[model samples]
Structures are given as structure tokens and as C-alpha cells.
Target: LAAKEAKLRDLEDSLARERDTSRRLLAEKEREMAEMRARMQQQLDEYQELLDIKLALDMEIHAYRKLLEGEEER
Candidate 1:
């Protein structure tokens, strides 16, 4: 009965250790996911800025083409 209790104690200790390790791994993964999300947000912001610039340039080009076409017709 003493030996059985000792074995049970050992199993409990092992389970505790496994639980701690699992919690630590989960925290690390959460931190990594946050970092990835931040990087994705930064990339999205950069793309949005580029898209705005492209749209503005396209508008300017269209205006120039219209003006030039009018001049040619005249």
C-alpha cells in the first residue's frame, strides 16, 4: 500500500510538470501570434498607403490625357 501511494505521488508530479510545460508553450505561441499580427498590420498599412498613391497618380494621368487630347483636337 505504501509502494502504491509512492507510485501515485510520482505520477502526480509528472502530470504537474506536464501541465506547467503545456502552459508555458501556450504562452509562447500566443506571443508569437501577436507578433505575427503586428507584422501583418504593418504590411497592410504600407499597402494601403501605396494604393492611395497609385490612385492619385492615376487621376493625374487621366487629367493630363484629357487635356492633351483636347489640345490635339483644337
Candidate 2:
């Protein structure tokens, strides 16, 4: 009985360590994923801004071309 009890205690300690390790791993992974998501979101916003500016410039150029066409007709 005594030997079995000691072995049981050992097993419990090992299991506790494993649980703590797994929890820590999960926490670190969560942090890493969060940072990655933030970076991606920031990059997406920047690219969206670029697209918006490009569209604005294209519209202005198109308007200018129409005005020039009118002048040529006159």
C-alpha cells in the first residue's frame, strides 16, 4: 500500500507539471496569434488607403481627359 501511494503521488506530480506546461504553451500561442492578426489588420488598412487614393487619382485624370476632349472639339 505504501509503495503504491508513493507511486501515485509521483504520477500526480507529473500530471500537474504537464498541465501547467500545456497551459503556458497555449497562452504563448494565443499571444503570437493576436500579434499576427494585428499586423495583418494594419497592413490591410494601409493597402485599402492606397487603393482609395489610386481611385481618386484615376477619377481626376478621367475628368481632365474629358475636358481636353471638349477643347479639341472646339
Candidate 3:
């Protein structure tokens, strides 16, 4: 009976250690995911800003071309 109890205790300890290791790994993965999300958000913002600037420039060019066409017609 004593030997059986010792074996049970050993199994329990091993299981606990495994659970702790798994928890630590999960936390690390969560941190990595959060960091990646932040970086992606930053990049997306920068891309949007560039897109807005390009659109504005295109509109200005179109206006300038219309003005020149009107002048030539006159």
C-alpha cells in the first residue's frame, strides 16, 4: 500500500508540472499574438495615410489639367 501511494504521488507531481509548463507556453503565445496585432495595426495606419495623400495629389493634377484645357479653348 505504501508503494502504491508513492507511485500515485509521483504521477500527480508530474501532471502538475506538465500543467504549469503548458500554461507558461500559452501565456508566451498570447504575448506574441498581441505584439503582432499591434505591429499590424501600426502598418495599416501608415498605409492609409499614404493612400489619402496619393488621392489628394491625383485630384489636384486633374483640376490642373481641366484648367489648362479651358485656357486653350478660350
Candidate 4:
């Protein structure tokens, strides 16, 4: 009976240690997900700035073309 009790005590201690290990692993994954979200946001901001510049240049080119056509007609 004493041996059985000793074995049960060891099992309980192992269970406690396993819980701590699980929590640490979960925390690591959460940190990685947060980092990925930050990177995604940074990339999106950069793409938006580049698109704005392209749009402005397209408008400028269209205006110049119209001005040239008017001169040719005159």
C-alpha cells in the first residue's frame, strides 16, 4: 500500500509539471502570432503609400496629354 501511495505521488507531481510546460508552449505561439500581425500591418501601410504615388502620377500624365491635344487642334 505504501508503494502504491508513492507511485500516486509521483504521478501527481508529473501532472503539475506538464501543466507548466503546456502554458509556456502556448505563450510562445501567441508571441509568434502577434509578431506576424505586426509585420502584416507594416507591409499594408507601405503598399498604400506606393499606390498613392502611382495614382498621382497617372493623373498628372492625363492632364499633360489633354493640354497637348488642345494645342495640336489650335
What are the models' TM-scores? 0.88, 0.82, 0.82, 0.79
lDDT of 2 by residue, 2-71 (tens): 7998999999999999999999999999999999999999999999999999999999999999999999
lDDT per residue, candidate 4, 1-74, as tens digits?
87999999999999999999999999999999999999999999999999999999999999999999999995
Q: Model 3: residues >4 Å from true position, as ranges?
A: 71-74
**Which residue pairs in candidate 1 collide?**
none
Error of 2 at 20 (Å): 1.2
Clash pairs, model 2 backbone = none
Model 1 lDDT tens row, 7-48 = 999999999999999999999999999999999999999999
CA displacement after TM-score superposition, residue 59 of candidate 4 (Å): 0.8
Clashing pairs in 4: none
Off by over 4 Å in 2: 71-74
Per-structure clash totals for the candidates: 0, 0, 0, 0
Highest TM-score: which candidate?
1
Candidate 3 colliding pairs: none
